[PDB]
Amino acid sequence: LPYLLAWDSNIFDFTTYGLFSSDKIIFNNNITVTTRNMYSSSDITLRSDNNRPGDYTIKADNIIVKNGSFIFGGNNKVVVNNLMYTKNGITFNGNNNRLESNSLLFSDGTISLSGKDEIVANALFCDTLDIRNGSSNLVTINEFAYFNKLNIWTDKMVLKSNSKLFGGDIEIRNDGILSADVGTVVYANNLDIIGSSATIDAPDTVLYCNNLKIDGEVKLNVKKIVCSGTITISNLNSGTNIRVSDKIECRSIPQNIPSGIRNLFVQNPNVNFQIPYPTIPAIIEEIKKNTFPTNWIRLDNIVEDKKDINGANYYSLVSTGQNSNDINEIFNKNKPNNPHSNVQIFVITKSGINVPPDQNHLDGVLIANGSLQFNGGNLNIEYVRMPQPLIDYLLSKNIIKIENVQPPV
Ligand SMILES: [Zn+2]
Numbered sequence: 001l002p003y004l005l006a007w008d009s010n011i012f013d014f015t016t017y018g019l020f021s022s023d024k025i026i027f028n029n030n031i032t033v034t035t036r037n038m039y040s041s042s043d044i045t046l047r048s049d050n051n052r053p054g055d056y057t058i059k060a061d062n063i064i065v066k067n068g069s070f071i072f073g074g075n076n077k078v079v080v081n082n083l084m085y086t087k088n089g090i091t092f093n094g095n096n097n098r099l100e101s102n103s104l105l106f107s108d109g110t111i112s113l114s115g116k117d118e119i120v121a122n123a124l125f126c127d128t129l130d131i132r133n134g135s136s137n138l139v140t141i142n143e144f145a146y147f148n149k150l151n152i153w154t155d156k157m158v159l160k161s162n163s164k165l166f167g168g169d170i171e172i173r174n175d176g177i178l179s180a181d182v183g184t185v186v187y188a189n190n191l192d193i194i195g196s197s198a199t200i201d202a203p204d205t206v207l208y209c210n211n212l213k214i215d216g217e218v219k220l221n222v223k224k225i226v227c228s229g230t231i232t233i234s235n236l237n238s239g240t241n242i243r244v245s246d247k248i249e250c251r252s253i254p255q256n257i258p259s260g261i262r263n264l265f266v267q268n269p270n271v272n273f274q275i276p277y278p279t280i281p282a283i284i285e286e287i288k289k290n291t292f293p294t295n296w297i298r299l300d301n302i303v304e305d306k307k308d309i310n311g312a313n314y315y316s317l318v319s320t321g322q323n324s325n326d327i328n329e330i331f332n333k334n335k336p337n338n339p340h341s342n343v344q345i346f347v348i349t350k351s352g353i354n355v356p357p358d359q360n361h362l363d364g365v366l367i368a369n370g371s372l373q374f375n376g377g378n379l380n381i382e383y384v385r386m387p388q389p390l391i392d393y394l395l396s397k398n399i400i401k402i403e404n405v406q407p408p409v
Helices: 259-264 282-288 325-331 388-396
Strands: 017-021 031-034 037-040 058-065 077-086 098-107 110-112 118-131 138-152 157-159 164-166 169-173 177-180 185-187 190-194 199-209 211-215 219-227 231-234 242-250 265-267 314-319 344-349 353-355 361-368 372-374 379-383
Touching: 017 031, 017 372, 017 379, 077 282, 098 110, 098 282, 190 199, 211 219, 242 259, 259 265, 314 325, 314 388, 325 344, 325 353, 344 388, 353 361
Parallel strands: 017 037, 017 361, 031 058, 031 379, 037 058, 058 077, 077 098, 098 118, 110 118, 118 138, 138 157, 138 164, 138 169, 157 177, 164 185, 169 190, 177 199, 185 199, 190 211, 199 219, 211 231, 219 242, 242 265, 314 344, 344 361, 353 372, 361 379
Antiparallel strands: none
16 A cells, blocks of 8 residues: 555556647746646746736646756745655755645755745655755654755754654754654664754654764754664763653663763663664656656657647647647747637647747646746746547557556555
C-alpha cells in the first residue's frame, strides 16, 4: 500500500494533459493555470504575481518535471492534488509563495524556501530541504518527510500529529524552529542544534540519532532522545532550556554535562535503531524510467501537418513545425477583445509554442516538443479534453498510445 502512494494511471494517458513540453515551460506574470496533468522535461518557471485575480496560480492533479526544476517567482499559489515530481529541485523566489501537495511531493534535488513561503505536504521526499532564507516560512508535514539533509535556520517546520521525519542529517541553527505535535517521531543520522535561538518544541516527540551535537544554550523540549553514536556538547553551561521528560538514552554519557541536566542521561552501551524508511512509490519509479513519457507520447511521430480538425467551438493544429506562422495563425482564431466568443485551441507540435502576448483566455491543450513560452502575462489557461476526432487522429498516427495501465502488485 505504501508502494501505491499517489499511483495515478492517468499519468500515462496523454489525453489528460493540459500543458506538455519536451523542453521548458516558461510562464509570465499573472498567469492562472487550471489543469489535470502537466509535464515538462526541463524547468518550469513561474514569474511573480503582482496582479493575479485567481485564488491560485496553478491548480493541477499532477506536475512532473522529468529533467528539471520547478521555479517559483513570488506570490505564486500552487495546488497539486496527487503528485508533484522534479528531478533537479524546487526553488522558491520572491517570497509569499504557497505549495499545497495533497499526496506526494518528490524531488531528487533541493527544495529551497525564500521567506514568507509555505509548503503544506502529506508525504515529502527530497535530497535537501532548506528552510534558511528569510523569515516567516512554514513547512507543515501531515505524514512524513524523508531527506538526506534538512536545514532549519529560520521559522519554521511543523510536524502534525503522528507524522515522521526520516533523515538524513538535520541541522537547526540561528532562528530555526522545529515544532511537533502528539505522536511524532524524528529519525536522523546526525542531529545538530546550534545556538541559543535554535529550537525544538516537541514535548511528545521521540528523536533517534547516531550523533547528537548541541552547541550553546539550545531550546529543546522533547520526550526522549536516543543517541547510538556520540553526543558532542559545547558552550553548554547551564542547560536551563533543555527539557526531556523521559530520558536521553545514549551509548556513552559525555563528560562535563551541567549538573542541572545530568539527571536526564541514561547509559545503554547497546542502544541501537534501524530507521524504517518509506519505500519509493511505484509511480515515481515508473516516471523515472526511460520509458516515460515516450512509451505513450511520441511527438516525432508527427510526419504530416493536420489542420482541418476544427468544429463550431474549436480549432486544432498538429504541426511538424516547418511552417513558423501556423501557430500564430491558430492563436489569431481567438480575438481577446471578444471574451464570450472564445473558441477552444488544441496545439500538438514538433516545434515549440510561443503564445502571443495579446492572449488572455485559452481553453484547450498545448503540447510541444520544443519549449512552451508565454510571451505575455494576464492570461487564464484552462484544460479542456481534446475533441474526440483529434484524439482518434493522434492515436491512428501513434503520436499517442493509451494503454490499460493498472497499479502494480
Ligand atoms: Zn476558460
